[PDB]
Symmetry: D2
Subunit: 334 residues, 4 copies
């Protein structure tokens, strides 16, 4: 029974909390978020504009978060080293604030008594990235701090692994059309720290170009593809669910139907739960609260010729990802 | 002539700048905003998601904001006391930060050398409030710090005035359906300071109830209506333009056509430039970049009977209000 | 047991089908829609942008629609007289096309062999209107064609009944902020048959004023309130969930706490499942797939004085109403 | 001086009309649209949710559209053979209904007396396609019926020309993130003809994959690139402005800065007015009402290697394309 701590009770923190509620092998025992009192915290957990209300009565008494019989400890500590994780026997800390993305910074959780840490984002430094279904078995129990990569990487890696393993990816460029994120502004304004100016432009009415190392990070989890992938993003006014568009060149030539079939037997076989497959005329809203990392859209993508393909895959960037964080938490503890 | 300073180069500050650019009787000489480098500030001014690109060249050299052939000074102080308005010879400071809405806080501009201050919002204390066309002539030149009220008050007040003058308002309740503002969040999160929980809810997908004092404020600029008006607001995913629905009970009976005509003659007579009138089948976007405070929508409202009415008026909550801040700045100086 | 047929398999058509799947006491045996082949119809039922995927597998075979051990006849006829409801043994026809809203038009369904008809919209003629919880017990089998009113009326009528019963309503005016509907247009264009020009304006970026008879229709189902209520609507870019904002004057004086408690009594007793009550800081998304006609929002509204109040109520215009249609269909058959 | 006729007074029809209002070299003398009364037609011309109010008074009298003082003839015909283009001395008809896209259909205008015709969309047959700046000089006056291609082709073709001219495109795949169009639905519903189910899915809340021939169409205007380019689209809830994202292999190797410099040089010289260049951190709203066909975004793209590039270009799909129709009209008349 993995004891999880959550630092940053935001989109991912709260949805990680929610996904653990249906998991026996993992339970959340402690939360930290200094920008939110207990009464406020309970409101944000109870109500969700995207994923609906919490499937359970959410109360607080005596400074605890009550989910029926379960009392969850709540802290409000800006300094992550002052969070008494070890007091609640926390096995793993889900680091979902977005501002401690370095081994030096994340390791402050260790000084508070947490055994291990997962960054809910790619690292700013050289912290081991792990993607469930792709390279998680290579994790070593003495690695105390790891990254679970981005939502976009969790989407592109399974697709790329399948395409590469069978046909061999020569080179690829990715576009992701990404749902709205908390680093964006409701109206034109200054981006946090004066970096990524476009992100501070009005979210409601703009297609917004964005940099992303998610495609390039696939080379970290799948070394074979080091130097063979990169990409960009475009932000759009969408609540959740994003889509990857991979234009790739392959070694062994194929028909699009053969590419689709290979992806289908991975989805039905060794990548069940991580990689999905569909042939339906789906749109983004059809993947809200889907827990897969990548759902391949057969009819959306296409082939220019025997070696040049456009491959389309969907992902609920909040929910798919939040599940993987649990999957990783359990794995690195067990 | 009038030399304007702007504290907070946000939605209002940048549009106060833009409007002042089109005027001869007033010029902006200084700007303060510590969350904005000079490069960033130029970019935010150059491009606008709502009101299009600034209609002039926007460059910078020597730490000065250049607008064609005019230097504007730029400061980056968090403490209004530390901004050297006096050297720039500022007559009025436009206090458009949202965080210095009392006489104690706003007076540090006067310490910095500025002659007078206009709060671009309702005050949190008993600072004098003025709405152009309603009570601005009652301005006393001894008053160095004033409020230009809210945008919603500037829309409602001219409507209530004309209606009250001719028919007498017994009592009124108001709803404003309001466009998106910078206090809102793109995704569900905790609102600043843990106040106004609903406003932290996803802006893109929700109708969000909001408290507003704008209808109570009409009682301050029109004392006769003190205690007779209040209301609420609903935030909606709209870039700009909001709408007031005033349900009022009148002492003197009238037909809807008589009420409409009275507003038409005010709009074309004494309140021209402040209050507008239309009988066209208009929608919110039709009032983007409309500089009027209030635009009565004749066909949108109706009457239940000879003393019970719903009166509908539009306002560009950004642009209309921004022009008023200039009108008031000129008035309190001249 | 109750055999329902549906005409117009749109937002209301499909969600009635959906609610009915959760119900044993009512079953959908037939469907008609001429703009929608059986393959296309299955796609539109399996996937919903607002309410999520259909709660079970959806296929078709031999011209029927399979939902487990169930088979639903599907027709594609523009003329309602040519749909064989009779051969399906249909008790009630859900008339949700939008275009057969008079007895003379709707009686075409009776010529097809159906026993009774519920118009899923307010009628354009003197057709009897019923609102569940308000006047439905006044129905008698005699009348073969009825109306379930509008979503808005199903929201307002319970609120108004309770307030009128306890305090007495003198006069009332209502604004509804309404979610988007299928009569609206994506880009500016001509409204259907030149009616309601405003509805033809871009739905994504506009607050759109609109007429409604929904408040005036309360006086049919509640004769007492005839001549005492009317109102208007503002359409906005929201998928589903709408809010009613009722300004009313009461005969007996009252504090807002007394008003709230009365609504809370009704919602917990006689109007359980029709009228709801909340004290939370809710936004529109919190009511998606909420099956109640009316959810009173205590903290959203307020009183100006002892006799003048603003009362705020939410409704899922799609789902709440779709369940009311089923309640009515059962009642007129039982 | 060139006299223009408009069949179909919709987004493209009305924006072509507006685009002509300013210009001296072309003039609209007659309009035809049967699904629109004159008064309604004046309403739709006067008000625009994207491009603001018509910059001139619009009225009608005696069945003439009056702009300022100028009388424009208005018709309501389903057979263009009956529209008196000849009487109005029309040099070119802008065919912008979307349903006369063959020689057989389009040639009814010629019997009506229109000297030439431009389809405001890709043809359903082998009608000669033209794109200004690209292959327009290969037009000869014997061709009376032509096509201005799509907005997407007009964005891509300029970018494809420059890159192919200097570096040689081996293969290319394109994504366009595209603004909402008239064929979309506000809420989930059946797309017309039963064609393209995804396009009937809710436009406000979805990323919607779409087919596009616009990348394959670049082979017709540039025979050298035939069979080398294809692509897909994603529709998103945006009022106007779209972006092309072209991934391609080049024959001759290059750095991104060299490629970017080559585009800049074409934008400043031979492709000025048609192709644009920027290194600013733009968002879609910055190109609303931009009359260029393609604006290259330098910072939004990147290179994987010396031969494999992602090139990004913006376009106001409404305004740029509309001005290109007029350009083509003037060209085919002179
Ligand atoms: N939302 C997504 O689409 C998504 C997907 C994958 C990864 N991520 C990553 O997960 C991280 C969180 O993203 P989010 O979308 O949940 O953002 P969010 O803004 O919703 O959550 C961040 C939370 O952390 C809290 N916080 C800030 N500083 C803190 C500190 N000092 N101590 C404790 N709490 C603090 C904030 O109050 C906030 O609630 C980011 O790094 C993001 O890149 C997000
Ligand atoms: N936006 C509207 O429709 C509207 C209408 C009328 C009035 N107002 C009022 O105007 C005020 C500003 O609102 P806005 O919409 O421009 O918000 P905004 O966020 O766009 O502007 C606030 C600006 O102030 C700056 N700022 C914050 N703290 C500062 C400080 N310490 N010193 C200097 N600058 C600081 C920020 O960087 C930001 O640029 C608010 O009080 C608001 O209620 C808004
Ligand atoms: N959507 C709401 O919020 C809501 C709420 C309450 C009541 N209603 C009412 O219900 C009715 C339907 O509304 P909707 O939202 O489902 O609209 P909708 O457009 O989604 O559904 C209408 C359906 O009827 C079909 N149709 C058209 N002509 C037909 C005919 N000749 N025969 C059979 N089918 C035909 C269309 O193909 C379409 O699928 C309307 O009258 C509306 O006012 C809607
Ligand atoms: N707006 C864009 O993003 C865009 C860009 C490039 C090309 N196009 C193309 O332009 C064409 C027009 O598209 P739109 O966006 O203007 O759509 P729209 O719906 O806004 O305009 C179509 C107009 O034609 C009228 N019409 C329909 N049938 C008619 C008939 N038979 N006779 C006369 N008028 C008729 C309608 O009343 C309507 O006003 C389409 O073929 C489209 O593919 C659109
Ligand atoms: N509080 C905002 C934290 C945050 C939230 C989301 C992101 S991202 O996943 O969009 F890059 C980044 C940072
Ligand atoms: N930076 C946030 C400042 C702010 C504060 C309040 C508003 S309001 O107009 O919604 F009251 C707008 C902007
Ligand atoms: N397909 C159009 C059917 C329709 C859909 C919605 C409405 S209304 O509820 O907005 F009045 C009316 C008619």
């Amino acid at each position: 029974a993995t004891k999880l701590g959550i630092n940053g009770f935001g989109r991912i923190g709260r949805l990680v909390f929610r996904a653990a509620f249906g998991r026996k092998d993992i339970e959340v025992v402690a939360i930290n978020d200094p920008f939110m009192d207990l009464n406020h915290l309970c409101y944000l957990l109870k109500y969700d504009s995207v994923h609906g209300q919490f499937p359970c009565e959410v109360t607080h008494a005596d400074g605890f978060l009550l989910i029926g019989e379960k009392k969850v400890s709540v802290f409000a500590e800006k300094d992550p080293s002052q969070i008494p994780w070890g007091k609640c026997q926390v096995d793993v800390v889900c680091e979902s604030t977005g501002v401690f993305l370095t081994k030096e910074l994340a390791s402050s959780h260790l000084k508070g008594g947490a055994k291990k840490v997962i960054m809910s984002a790619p690292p700013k430094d050289d912290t081991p990235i792990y993607v469930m279904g792709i390279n998680h078995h290579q994790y070593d129990t003495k690695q105390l701090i790891v990254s679970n990569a981005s939502c976009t990487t969790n989407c592109l890696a399974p697709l790329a692994k399948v395409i590469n393993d069978r046909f061999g990816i020569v080179e690829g460029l990715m576009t992701t059309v990404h749902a709205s994120t908390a680093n964006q502004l409701v109206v034109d304004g200054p981006s946090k720290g004066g970096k990524d100016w476009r992100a501070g432009r009005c979210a409601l009415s703009n297609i917004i170009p964005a940099s992303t190392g998610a495609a390039k990070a696939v080379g970290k989890v799948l070394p074979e593809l080091n130097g063979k992938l990169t990409g960009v993003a475009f932000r759009v006014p969408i609540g959740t669910v994003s889509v990857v568009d991979l234009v790739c060149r392959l070694q062994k030539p194929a028909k699009y139907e053969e590419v689709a079939l290979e992806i289908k037997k991975a989805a039905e076989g060794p990548l069940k739960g991580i990689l999905g497959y569909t042939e339906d005329e789906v749109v983004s809203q059809d993947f809200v609260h889907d827990n897969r990392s990548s759902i391949f859209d057969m009819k959306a993508g296409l082939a220019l010729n025997d070696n040049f393909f456009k491959l389309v895959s969907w992902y609920d960037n909040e929910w798919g990802y939040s599940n993987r964080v649990l999957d990783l938490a359990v794995h690195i503890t067990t």
